[PDB]
Structures are given as C-alpha cells and as structure tokens.
Design a protein around this ligand. Structure first.
Ligand SMILES: Cc1ccc(NC(=O)c2ccc(CN3CCN(C)CC3)cc2)cc1Nc1nc(-c2cccnc2)cs1
Ligand SMILES: Cc1ccc(NC(=O)c2ccc(CN3CCN(C)CC3)cc2)cc1Nc1nc(-c2cccnc2)cs1
Lengths: 304, 304
C-alpha cells in the first residue's frame, strides 16, 4: 500500500559522476568506459555566452585545459571532441564501475530519475517527467549542469537526460546523451522561454487507477463515455488527446481493477468539470500527471 | 530553482542489502561488517502470528536454518541472537562495502530516505517523514520487510528505520536499528491501528519559506501575529504547537527571505482560515508538511 514519487536506486550512476573543470568553470561529467561526457558550455567564458562559436572555442583548447577528478583521483585527458552540445573527453583509464548502459532518448510524458550533483558529488535523487513542451520541472542550483537523468531496467542503465540550463520560469532544459536538446532550446544566451504546456492525460488516468488500487474510490461513477466525447472535454481543459494506443496501454490496470478505461474517463471528466469538492486522491488535491502506466504497475500491487 | 521531494543517493545502502530466508519466509536484511540485521518475524509461521513467543521460537532455530544471500553469493551464518524486535545474524564475512554508519533514532516530524527492496534487491528510493503518531506513509508491498530508512551526512549513513508491517489504513510501522518500535505497535497479530495524527507546523512554515525562495509570494501579507495567538489557530486546525525553539530553527530561512517567522505565521493563519482560492504553492493545492527546515536549506538556494 501507498504511492510515492519513487526514483530508481542511484548507486550505478553515482559511480559514474566526475568533476570537470575548464578555466574557472566547474561542472559535472559522466564517466563511462574511457570517456567523460559533459555540457560543452564548460569551455565558455562570460564574454562568450552572447554569440559563441563552439567550434572555434574548442579548437583553441588542448587536453591539458580540462581537469577531470573522480573522487580524489585525477583522470588524465588524452583526447577531446564535440558531439552536438556535449563534449567527449577521452581519458586514460576506463571507469571500473561502468554499468551496463544505453543512451536512449525519451518522449514527452515519460518519466525518469535525476541524480542531482555538485562538483562531481551526488547530492540527491528524485523523479521527473519530460513535459509536453520538452522542459522538466527539476530541482537544480548553480553547479548542477552535467547532472543526468536515467531509468534502470534489470541491470541496464538507460541514460536519457543531461542537464544544461535553467529557463526564466524556473524550469529546466537539457539534452539526450548524444548532445541533442530536448525541445527548441540552445546553449547560448537568448530570450528563450518554455512554450505552452499541456497535461499528460494518459498519466492522470494511470494515477486514478493507482488510487483505486490503493482504496480511493469516491470519484468513481456508473457512467461511461465515448473516446470522441472525452476528447472534446480534454481539449477544453488543456489535456492531451487520448488515443486508442493509450487505452491499450492502460489495459493491464483496467483488467486489474475491473474498471474500463472509458469508465475511468467519465470520472476524469467529472473531476475536470466539478473539482474535488474538498477531497483528496492519493494525498493530492490536484490531478497528478507525472506517473506513467509503467510507473503505476511497477509500484502498485498486481492482485486481480 | 525548483523544489522536489528529494532522497539521498542510495548507493551506500544498496551495497548493504541482502536476502534472508528462514523456512518459506523471505525478506530483506542489512549487512554491516560481519552482522546481518533483519526483522525477527522472519522466524514466524502462520500458526505463530497469533501469540508468538519469540524467545521460544528462536531457541528452536540453528544457524543452518537461516539462508543469507548477497547477490549471487551465499553468506554462512555462524551466530544468531535477538535484539528487541530485530535479529542479528553473525556471518563469516565482513561486508567490504560497509559505509561509515550510525544507528540513530529519529523524532516525529523528521524526514528520511527509504530504499524499498524485494528479495534483497533494491527497487526504488523515496523520501518519508515520521508522522506525529509514529507511522510513516510509505510505499511498500509484500516482501518489503527489512527495507531501511536513512539519512546521509558527509560520508556517514545514519540508519533510522527498518520496515516491519503495514497497518489497516495502509500506513507503515517499524523499528529503529536497535529493534525498538516507533510508536505503540508490536510485531504480532492484533487489531492495532494508527492513532490520531496532527500536521507538522514547523515543516509547513519551512515549506512556505521554500516557496518564497522559489518565487511564490501570493500568500504573503503585511500582518504579524503573536506566538500565543498563532497557537490558538494551530489547535483549531489540528496543527502542532509552535515553540520558540521552532522559531529559532527557522531563523536562517527568515533571514534569507527577510520575512520574520511570526510574519509568515500570519500567512499560514490566513491559508488555514481561507484556503488557497484556486491557487497553488510549489505545485501543491495542499499545505505540505513533510519537508523539515534542514530539507529546505539543503535543497534551496542560499542567496540573501
Ligand atoms: C546554457 C549555459 C551556457 C553557458 C554557460 N556559461 C556561462 O554563462 C559562463 C561560464 C563561465 C564563465 C567564466 N569565464 C570562463 C572561465 N574563466 C576564464 C573565467 C571567465 C562565465 C559564464 C552556462 C549555461 N547554463 C547555466 N545553467 C545554470 C543553471 C542554474 C540553475 C539550475 N540549472 C542551471 C546557470 S548558467
Ligand atoms: C508484523 C508481522 C508479523 C509476522 C509476519 N509473518 C507472517 O504473518 C507469516 C510468516 C511466515 C508464514 C509461513 N510459515 C513459516 C514458513 N514456513 C514454515 C511456512 C509457514 C506465514 C505467516 C509478518 C509481519 N509483517 C508483515 N508485513 C507485511 C507488509 C505488507 C505490505 C507492506 N508492508 C508490510 C505483510 S505481513
């Protein structure tokens, strides 16, 4: 029983975090085999953030300009190259703690764990979702760049996010581990801002199923809706459209609770139109959209 | 920017988790130096949960009745003893991954990280608070007993909680690592239930400070209250009394925001009496009480 924002255990990633210094800029890197990955803006100056040409900036660097430290051990840099918005620093030692890993790119609406680090040292772990507008609502301070987001499946770490910047509304943007930004953001100084966002409908439905499995039932009703009629309501309240694939993905949770997806959609319509009338669902007075169907199945009992 | 329920990185504890089997019962244990700690109810049967005498049950066990597995490695048990509600299994190998550690007992209102484990294998990490009634609102399924709660300060893991049971309302109870239960609960079958709970006032105030530091200010006002007048309102809404020591503990956050504690108490009084009128604070429509002042300082910027 219970339902929490639960991250993956972080030990496999902790053993990969290093400190990268270039000039007077320090940030975090990810050490896998004999390569350290970090944001390329580590090579920038304050006089460079206006209109940087990173190809120029990197040609003017040598391996000796990069100081890499793993705990109390200095790693010797023997090669450097750019890949999109990340830097690859080849080092003379393979990381003995390298887990089985993959570099994946995630979709908006999917979740992952973030290991927030400062000066190469892990500080905390929390769960994040990629928003529809390709930002994340993280918790990061100055020094956190190069912190990573990941999921773990059996023994394998799938890295999906490296942190690069904070936008003016306080939300965060970054890249996959190939250095390609999520969303229409760049690693330079501009007036860039998060675009309009939407609520992740399939996740809200998953979380209503989690609530039923955990004994909250007050929002259920005897009505069922059609998919087209539900999607008219979704549009009005700035929810994403629900697809048949979403309905299919919710199949296991529907079977376990015996509540058809379009039955639960009729509950969600009533919550959107009427509010909660002073009640809560899984300790929240808002509809929560940062749990995927997978997250719910992973955490919740499977009985029925 | 941002504010998340953030756990401590879990790697130091992951390396301590083992599987303990006795008969057909499997649960988790904590392997530190050459001792494995686990709930003593691992030695129980279904015909024993009524009125167990654990001293009798343990006298009838031998070391060979305990199977301990660390990953794919079986640990040989060479001694067993009871300490209050935990069992200490002496093994023939010290854990090479033992961190610096302490066994601490926490106070109601304090927070800690939980590493949820199944079959000796870590599954997820989340943040928990000890409620005033000595329960925790965790996320645990069958098989999770023996999972631990902890905080980390510099290199040192302070273990404070071992999981033993789920109460009828879905909340959880357990012991410190000396085997002494938090609250009026026992590791046998009774009608025991969580007692009445209260909201942790100093934590709500800390979280309002976190909100101000993160730019939410709509709930602020020009009024200040007295401590006695605030505590009359606290009583009415089932909040704990605020003490001068609480005011002192909030000193750093008050100085950083320039908002006196009794000024912020006047905001909290208005929120309690009027609600939020459709607005949110740090993405919540409820007043959140599971962040301590320390948690806020640890996570939030320190500027001002
Ligand atoms: C996207 C980006 C692009 C360039 C930079 N770098 C800089 O602005 C910068 C870097 C280094 C310097 C110092 N110079 C270079 C070193 N030395 C020669 C002195 C002069 C001055 C400015 C940072 C970022 N990203 C940032 N992320 C944050 C941040 C804050 C809070 C949460 N998450 C991210 C702050 S700045
Ligand atoms: C407090 C307590 C006391 C005794 C027990 N153990 C049992 O009830 C029990 C243990 C073992 C058996 C099997 N027997 C012994 C082994 N073998 C001889 C077969 C017969 C039957 C029952 C469990 C607990 N705690 C439990 N925690 C949970 C639980 C569920 C979800 C979340 N957190 C905890 C379920 S039972």
């Amino acid at each position: 029983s219970g339902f929490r924002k639960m991250a993956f255990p972080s030990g496999k990633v902790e053993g990969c975090m290093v400190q990268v210094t270039c000039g007077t800029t320090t940030l975090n890197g990810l050490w896998l085999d004999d390569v350290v990955y970090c944001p390329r803006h580590v090579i920038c100056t304050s006089e460079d953030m206006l209109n940087p040409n990173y190809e120029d900036l990197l040609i003017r660097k040598s391996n000796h300009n990069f100081l890499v430290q793993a705990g109390n051990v200095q790693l010797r840099v023997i090669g450097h190259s750019m890949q999109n918005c990340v830097l690859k620093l080849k080092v003379d030692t393979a990381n003995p703690k390298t887990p089985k890993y993959k570099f994946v790119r995630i979709q908006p609406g999917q979740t992952f764990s973030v290991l927030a680090c400062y000066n190469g040292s892990p500080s905390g772990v929390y769960q994040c979702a990629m928003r529809p507008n390709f930002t994340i609502k993280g918790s990061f301070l100055n020094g956190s760049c190069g912190s990573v987001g990941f999921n773990i499946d059996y023994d394998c770490v799938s890295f999906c996010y490296m942190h690069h910047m904070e936008l003016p509304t306080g939300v965060h943007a970054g890249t996959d581990l190939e250095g390609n930004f999520y969303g229409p953001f760049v690693d330079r100084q501009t007036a860039q801002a998060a675009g309009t966002d939407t609520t992740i409908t399939v996740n809200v439905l998953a979380w209503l199923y989690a609530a039923v499995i955990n004994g909250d039932r007050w929002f259920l009703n005897r009505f069922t809706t059609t998919l087209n009629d539900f999607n008219l309501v979704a549009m009005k309240y700035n929810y994403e459209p629900l697809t048949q694939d979403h309905v299919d993905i919710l199949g296991p949770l529907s079977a376990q609770t015996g509540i058809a997806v379009l039955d639960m959609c009729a509950s969600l319509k009533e919550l959107l139109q009427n509010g909660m009338n002073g009640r809560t669902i899984l300790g929240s007075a808002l509809l929560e959209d940062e749990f995927t169907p997978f997250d719910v199945v992973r955490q919740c009992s499977g009985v029925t």
